[PDB]
Design a protein around this ligand. Structure first.
Ligand SMILES: CCCCCCCCCCCCCC(=O)OC[C@H](COP(=O)(O)OCC[N+](C)(C)C)OC(=O)CCCCCCCCCCCCC
Ligand SMILES: CCCCCCCCCCCCCC(=O)OC[C@H](COP(=O)(O)OCC[N+](C)(C)C)OC(=O)CCCCCCCCCCCCC
Ligand SMILES: CCCCCCCCCCCCCC(=O)OC[C@H](COP(=O)(O)OCC[N+](C)(C)C)OC(=O)CCCCCCCCCCCCC
Ligand SMILES: CCCCCCCCCCCCCC(=O)OC[C@H](COP(=O)(O)OCC[N+](C)(C)C)OC(=O)CCCCCCCCCCCCC
Ligand SMILES: CCCCCCCCCCCCCC(=O)OC[C@H](COP(=O)(O)OCC[N+](C)(C)C)OC(=O)CCCCCCCCCCCCC
Ligand SMILES: CCCCCCCCCCCCCC(=O)OC[C@H](COP(=O)(O)OCC[N+](C)(C)C)OC(=O)CCCCCCCCCCCCC
Ligand SMILES: CCCCCCCCCCCCCC(=O)OC[C@H](COP(=O)(O)OCC[N+](C)(C)C)OC(=O)CCCCCCCCCCCCC
Ligand SMILES: CCCCCCCCCCCCCC(=O)OC[C@H](COP(=O)(O)OCC[N+](C)(C)C)OC(=O)CCCCCCCCCCCCC
Ligand SMILES: CCCCCCCCCCCCCC(=O)OC[C@H](COP(=O)(O)OCC[N+](C)(C)C)OC(=O)CCCCCCCCCCCCC
Ligand SMILES: CCCCCCCCCCCCCC(=O)OC[C@H](COP(=O)(O)OCC[N+](C)(C)C)OC(=O)CCCCCCCCCCCCC
Ligand SMILES: C[C@H](CCC(=O)NCCC[N+](C)(C)CCCS(=O)(=O)[O-])[C@H]1CC[C@H]2[C@@H]3[C@H](O)C[C@@H]4C[C@H](O)CC[C@]4(C)[C@H]3C[C@H](O)[C@]12C
Ligand SMILES: C[C@H](CCC(=O)NCCC[N+](C)(C)CCCS(=O)(=O)[O-])[C@H]1CC[C@H]2[C@@H]3[C@H](O)C[C@@H]4C[C@H](O)CC[C@]4(C)[C@H]3C[C@H](O)[C@]12C
Ligand SMILES: C[C@H](CCC(=O)NCCC[N+](C)(C)CCCS(=O)(=O)[O-])[C@H]1CC[C@H]2[C@@H]3[C@H](O)C[C@@H]4C[C@H](O)CC[C@]4(C)[C@H]3C[C@H](O)[C@]12C
Ligand SMILES: C[C@H](CCC(=O)NCCC[N+](C)(C)CCCS(=O)(=O)[O-])[C@H]1CC[C@H]2[C@@H]3[C@H](O)C[C@@H]4C[C@H](O)CC[C@]4(C)[C@H]3C[C@H](O)[C@]12C
Ligand SMILES: OC[C@H]1O[C@@H](O)[C@H](O)[C@@H](O)[C@@H]1O
Lengths: 241, 241, 241, 241
């Protein structure tokens, strides 16, 4: 709380600071689309590469400033950690030879989420449902795991591409979950060799489908139940009192 | 409010006027189906072309009359603006050389929506949900935008048809959203060259799917919550009073 | 109400009568599966053909008896009319030369629905939702109709199989509604010739999808609202009284 | 209740016993994944085969102990019966020559469900919805059965792979239910020979789809109705009393 501390603290926390960052993101966003065209890149490429290095500099300063202001409270904020790791990624230099990190640089456009509070509320809303499903996700994954193992050893030898490997079978089973080509592309070919392959995949399709629908039904109905508790208690004690 | 004004105002606003338009639309509707058959067109084509020019004349008169009656209130009515722009389109002549406008002429059948009030209520109902989703739509589109950029530069060089271009990648990503052939048609081919391509598309499939379902769940549950507020207040103050 | 009338009326209305019919249906049901195997048919075919003619005789008698008992009240009962028309179909003889009616004979197994009251309740439940959707169905069909006409004339000339005809276009548009191969099978081929074909089908996919989901959401939420009216009135007037 | 009985009864019922089993399952689970790699199997295969025989021994002892403790109450517990039949399967020796039972051995990983009570609650939750649907399932299956018979005899002769047989037709009809390639893969080929085949499959697609959605809607709305009964009674009699 020194006098130097509050100097920067009043900047960082200013609406102009936030607004300025958003301007940059929206600008670097448009810039990253244009960088997609080799035509544009041949003409104006050096400009954009610099604007890019400019922006990432600013964002590094910015993240350093917020760390001064917020201190340990910054590394316990998920939105700040995200901003951190996105900016960290952008710093690993293009010479790294692993172009994956060059492409991951686009994740900085997600600042337009962490910085706009109406976006934060949505993402928070969406994510909020997930912790109640962790056990169902675990059940589903165990299920996938068991069936991946059985598939690999029923079909891996004749169908190595689809089932030669735990991973390949996981992949194929996820594909059948989405029902994408599950019969013409997978199970019908399978059955020219394993005529009962349908006894594996149909029940797999039933379970996995039943569970997902039931997840959604339970979420709606159990929420409506809580809304009803809060209304019961209110009505019932405006009557008692 | 002159005496000439109300002369036409009583026509325009008459049930017979409305009924007459609907008759025409339903007639021009049947006519536009028959115009689809070259057989029919070879026999009776000139008849229909004229009936068509007739109807569009009437509709132009009609729209002019409603503008006299309603004045500035007409250009603040979305149903009137629609009727306007559909009739405007039909006026651009067949010589224009841009047959798109010739085909857009079919949109005049949508008068059967703007003119029948039971239809207006449905469309109004449906559209009513949209303004609350604008922020989610924006989040989704930003998401698509970020992933379109990463895809274009991970896969555009070897897969120009599916990913050579921001637009092509947008297209393909929408296709994967609907899950149409996402694995046999897209990701499996992709992985003969980029074995980890599944680390891109599966999480993309999870997010986009999770969000859409969660949109629907939130709409049902948040509405049921409002219905519960209005019932709380009623019950609670018939008790207080 | 004569003494002969009630003689048969007590049979027709007896539990044994109903039970007997169900036995027959379940028996003719098993029989119609076995008739599917040419092996079985070569061995036991003449037996089954007769059992079949037997059963349809009985059912004709049965339907005649119920008409005596129920009189005009029988032709105002949808379950009876169904039983009627299914038995009518079975009477048109195999010599007719239109094997469609030979196959429609299988519809008599649906007696196992019209005769078992737990089934009747389900089907009644399901059908009950439909009259409230008639206007939405009409909107959807008008929509399909307008888009079928535009598609036929944008794409019918180069793509006669998918769009050469109002009917063909209806078909294809229903296929795109279910999203079956809409992109790899239809729109991607289309775009090698009409690069903007995506401006037609994507918005078509949005509308048709939006509407169906919104139909379901409205049904759940509007029902929950009615359940809330009936509970309001009860609570509110046990308080008033 | 002898003194020897309670000796083992206190073990079986101990938290350490349960915990120990779970450790084993999670260990044999990891082991069954590694057994998937021929590389690993060539190096460490004999180890795993023994660990496997070890674990199944333990589980046999374990199941015998729980039978002593629980007696007839064990064969009326579905979770115990499952554990039983999974362990029974594992006992049939590898010499049996029916490798299906060798693969079914993986089902022992489902102990991680029967033994962890948070999992039991989920599966119990999910299964709980099913008994109310039995009649709808029956209606659906009758429906499939009737349509399988009609399809087999309309299309079995020209399309033996898809419809030559009651079973083949069942399969294909389930495929059309999931909408997987129903048009490009099935109905479009069908219509080059049977131009009206769409009069069969489209209504089939409507019914089967309508029913499934309606099942889900009814489940949500009928539950919300019960939640409303329990809240009515509470509110209404805190007012009466
Ligand atoms: C109602 C909820 C439903 C949730 C269902 C979840 C069930 C599990 C989903 C798994 C998805 C499919 C994963 C997959 O593709 O597996 C690949 C990997 C290893 O494969 P690998 O052999 O490297 O590569 C296969 C492709 N190839 C041969 C061309 C290189 O295989 C693995 O290594 C297995 C990875 C397991 C991932 C578990 C994901 C947890 C879900 C997170 C929750 C998100 C909520 C929004
Ligand atoms: C009862 C359950 C208890 C919990 C158990 C959870 C942990 C299980 C881990 C099992 C790990 C098994 C890994 C494995 O077998 O890898 C197989 C393959 C590699 O095959 P390999 O033949 O070694 O490749 C040789 C390559 N070459 C020729 C070039 C030399 O590589 C792959 O296929 C990739 C491996 C994907 C593993 C996916 C793991 C899913 C975890 C699910 C957890 C569920 C918890 C409830
Ligand atoms: C839960 C809500 C979910 C909403 C998700 C929305 C996410 C975004 C959907 C985008 C849909 C796909 C658009 C698409 O095809 O992109 C094409 C264009 C430019 O492509 P272009 O390169 O011209 O042509 C590609 C095809 N080709 C090469 C054969 C000519 O690409 C563009 O120019 C991008 C256009 C962006 C459109 C944004 C649409 C907003 C949705 C409206 C809300 C409707 C509610 C009923
Ligand atoms: C952090 C985000 C901030 C917000 C940013 C939103 C605005 C972004 C606009 C980016 C515009 C980039 C346009 C672009 O790169 O076009 C690429 C291609 C043309 O490639 P090009 O190589 O120029 O074609 C040469 C043709 N030749 C050979 C015959 C001479 O043409 C195409 O591929 C069509 C371009 C489709 C653009 C789709 C725009 C989606 C907007 C999403 C907005 C999300 C807001 C939350
Ligand atoms: C995990 C949840 C993520 C959710 C957000 C999505 C993030 C995006 C992940 C993107 C992964 C894309 C992987 C892929 O296959 O892309 C292609 C690259 C490069 O191909 P490469 O393997 O170099 O083969 C080149 C062959 N050649 C020379 C003949 C052309 O392949 C590679 O270089 C493989 C490298 C694997 C990277 C793994 C990245 C982990 C996720 C990123 C960090 C989280 C951000 C929130
Ligand atoms: C949320 C509700 C969604 C409802 C959406 C309904 C929208 C309309 C659905 C239409 C379905 C597709 C009909 C179709 O395939 O059209 C074929 C016919 C004439 O085709 P045609 O040229 O004879 O044959 C085409 C095939 N070919 C060339 C190989 C012989 O084309 C016609 O003749 C048109 C027939 C219009 C049928 C209208 C159906 C009303 C729906 C009934 C409600 C059921 C509720 C359970
Ligand atoms: C503003 C809307 C007002 C309401 C209008 C509703 C009534 C519309 C009826 C239109 C009837 C048009 C029939 C038509 O054009 O048929 C075209 C084709 C036959 O083509 P054609 O070239 O004659 O075949 C010649 C055969 N050859 C070479 C062997 C001699 O045959 C076909 O393609 C089959 C025709 C399918 C008709 C589907 C009708 C859907 C009704 C939707 C109603 C919506 C109400 C809200
Ligand atoms: C809203 C609820 C929706 C429920 C819808 C249920 C409707 C019926 C589903 C039937 C699923 C398809 C069964 C199927 O593939 O049929 C095959 C068998 C005999 O086929 P088969 O000729 O041996 O083999 C065909 C394949 N081939 C030629 C290559 C060897 O065909 C048969 O033998 C018939 C088997 C009937 C099974 C009935 C299943 C009851 C559902 C259980 C409820 C689960 C709830 C989680
Ligand atoms: C009104 C309804 C009353 C209830 C009726 C329920 C019971 C129906 C049972 C019917 C059994 C018919 C079995 C049948 O026809 O099998 C046909 C084929 C075998 O064909 P086949 O030509 O004998 O094979 C000869 C093989 N060869 C050349 C090597 C010598 O093999 C197959 O295709 C497999 C058979 C699949 C049977 C699926 C049964 C579904 C039950 C649905 C029950 C619904 C209850 C509400
Ligand atoms: C409308 C809602 C219905 C809902 C319940 C479903 C009822 C089932 C309808 C079945 C329609 C099947 C039509 C179809 O394409 O089947 C094939 C037949 C016969 O083929 P065909 O056209 O004779 O060509 C033979 C060519 N050859 C000599 C070289 C082999 O094709 C024909 O013979 C065409 C005949 C069209 C029959 C139209 C039937 C109307 C519906 C049945 C009455 C309602 C029952 C509730
Ligand atoms: C019952 C099922 C599956 C678990 C199981 O079946 N046991 C689980 C999975 C997701 C869970 C919901 C979400 O978490 C959101 C929310 C959190 C609140 O805090 C309490 C209410 C609510 C609606 C949760 C209720 C319930 O817990 C759900 C439906
Ligand atoms: C919560 C989510 C997403 C936004 C977010 O997560 N924040 C948004 C997206 C669509 C929104 C609904 C619709 O607009 C219809 C309706 C308008 C009323 O006026 C208020 C109630 C209701 C049900 C809205 C509630 C809520 O606002 C929803 C579910
Ligand atoms: C609002 C939408 C579309 C019409 C429109 O948007 N206007 C229509 C289509 C189907 C209609 C429901 C069903 O009929 C079943 C039921 C009949 C009862 O009698 C009244 C309640 C309920 C839930 C109906 C409410 C409402 O009418 C629905 C949702
Ligand atoms: C109405 C439909 C179809 C049967 C029909 O239409 N008749 C059937 C099929 C599944 C049934 C529900 C589930 O069983 C779960 C639960 C059991 C409780 O005990 C009572 C409440 C609830 C929600 C049931 C209500 C109703 O019974 C449902 C919706
Ligand atoms: O206590 C919080 C502090 O953590 C340290 O790691 C940093 O160097 C400081 O700048 C930060 O304020």
């Amino acid at each position: 709380g020194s006098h130097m501390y509050l100097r920067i603290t009043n900047i960082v926390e200013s609406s102009f600071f936030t607004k300025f960052i958003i301007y940059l993101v929206v600008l670097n966003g448009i810039t990253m689309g244009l960088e997609t065209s080799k035509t544009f890149m041949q003409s104006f490429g050096v400009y954009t590469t610099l604007f890019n290095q400019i922006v990432i500099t600013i964002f590094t300063i910015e993240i350093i400033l917020r760390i001064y202001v917020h201190r340990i409270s910054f590394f316990k904020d998920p939105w700040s950690l995200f901003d951190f790791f996105v900016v960290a990624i952008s710093l690993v230099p293009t010479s790294s030879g692993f172009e994956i990190l060059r492409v991951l640089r686009v994740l900085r456009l997600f600042r337009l989420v962490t910085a706009v509070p109406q976006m934060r509320k949505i993402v928070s809303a969406l994510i909020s449902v997930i912790p109640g499903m962790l056990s169902v996700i675990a059940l589903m994954t165990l299920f996938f795991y068991i069936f991946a193992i059985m598939a690999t050893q029923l079909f891996g030898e004749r169908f190595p591409e689809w089932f030669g490997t735990l991973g390949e079978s996981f992949y194929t089973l996820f594909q059948v979950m989405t029902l994408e080509s599950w019969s013409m592309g997978i199970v019908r070919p399978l059955m020219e060799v394993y005529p009962y392959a349908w006894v594996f995949f149909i029940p797999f399709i039933f379970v996995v489908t039943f569970v997902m629908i039931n997840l959604v039904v339970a979420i709606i109905v159990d929420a409506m139940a809580i809304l009803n508790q809060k209304e019961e208690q209110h009505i019932i004690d405006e009557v008692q009192s």
